[PDB]
């Protein structure tokens, strides 16, 4: 198996930029290298074959070059429809192998999250379960950290999170984390807090509530 490596998994860029994506192979593949584009919707098309030949109908802003073990794909004047994930793939031998993919995102100014905490509803509590939700809204870049604290005890292992794709209008990200407790555990404690750090925040942001107030 020849290993294909795309060192940069995520790449931020602005419309109009020239963008380059690198790919390295674990041995000389003699330019037997293809590039594929996968849209956010999941659909795949070939862009370049044999290192630098554009496939039919692929616009001229795409190009590729390289040899030996080092290859690259270049977009000369990035457009909105080019925001996607790019994979390289060798066909020097079987099995055909792919790189890990390089996902483009749009660059923008740093934006701090707006933080909100939500207690469990009385209706859920009647059922025996308490879900506490922390919302980190409209921040940039994607990297953010948060900590759940219950009566000042850091909680690790009882929450799940998910993150939106980059917003089409303001280029930000949002994140939601849910802390799950049994009703009996939820009622054993008073202060529920979500504490957030982000490179846009000059100091951490804590939102909290007191159960029953």
């Amino acid at each position: 198996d020849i290993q294909m490596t795309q060192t940069t998994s995520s790449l931020s860029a602005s419309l109009g930029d020239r963008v380059t994506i690198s790919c390295s192979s674990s041995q000389d593949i003699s330019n037997y290298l293809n590039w594929y584009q996968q849209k956010p919707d999941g659909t795949v098309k070939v862009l370049i074959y044999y290192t630098s030949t554009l496939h039919l109908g692929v616009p001229s802003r795409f190009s590729g070059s390289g040899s030996g073990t080092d290859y690259s794909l270049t977009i000369s004047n990035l457009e909105l429809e080019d925001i996607a994930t790019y994979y390289c793939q060798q066909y020097y031998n079987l099995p055909w192998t792919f790189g890990g993919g390089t996902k483009l995102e749009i660059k923008r100014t740093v934006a701090a999250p707006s933080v909100f905490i939500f207690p469990p509803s009385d209706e859920q509590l009647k059922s025996g379960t308490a879900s506490v939700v922390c919302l980190l809204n409209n921040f940039y870049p994607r990297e953010a950290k948060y900590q759940w604290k219950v009566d000042n005890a850091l909680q690790s292992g009882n929450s799940q999170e998910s993150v939106t794709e980059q917003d089409s209008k303001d280029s930000t990200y949002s994140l939601s984390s849910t802390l799950t407790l049994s009703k009996a555990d939820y009622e054993k404690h008073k202060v529920y807090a979500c504490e957030v750090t982000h490179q846009g925040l000059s100091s951490p942001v804590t939102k909290s509530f007191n159960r029953g107030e």
């Binding site: 037997y32 793939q89 890990g100 707006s114 879900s131 919302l135 509530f209």
Partner: protein, 223 residues
Amino acid sequence: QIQLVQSGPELKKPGETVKISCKASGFTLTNYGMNWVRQTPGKGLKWMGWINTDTGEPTYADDFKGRFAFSLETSASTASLQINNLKNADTATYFCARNPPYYYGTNNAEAMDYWGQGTAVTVSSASTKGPSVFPLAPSSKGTAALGCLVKDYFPEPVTVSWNSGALTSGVHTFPAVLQSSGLYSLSSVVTVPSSSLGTQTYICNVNHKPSNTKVDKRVEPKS
């Protein structure tokens, strides 16, 4: 026009078998190789093998020798992937993709030059359940956030809208998360003017087709 159209999504229980079909139109199936590619959620692409479309001979990548079978149905212009004895780890999207046959001096791309749209296979023992919908009530302490917590449903997906689709600005509906129960949960939020909280009604509309579950849940400041 060259098209590869795959069969639709499949939900299976462990140990079952699934057959994924890939219908070729706008070109002669029998003139090109046919490849199968797997993408697990998180999105690595992995080549599973190919089937010689002229002879019918399949070739499997080593990680896919065993439970996988490539087949042809030439009279239907269709190529097929069968996965036997499904495991939860088989949960993935499977693509078929054609490649022009290689011969010395050819001018064609030796690439997978046209891809099917992918077939998503989900493997789980969970049974179908509609969600509970709970309020994420706006804090009583500018811009306010409120939302709905759509908890404990199976399978994906649910659709969420706000005020029957009249409210779209500031809405974020998050990817579902799979809980250790095997059930999914997701949240949908929207940010609104704090001043609107006493006068505007906010309702999240939740639809879970697999269970025929529809819920219109008003989200209001708690008293």
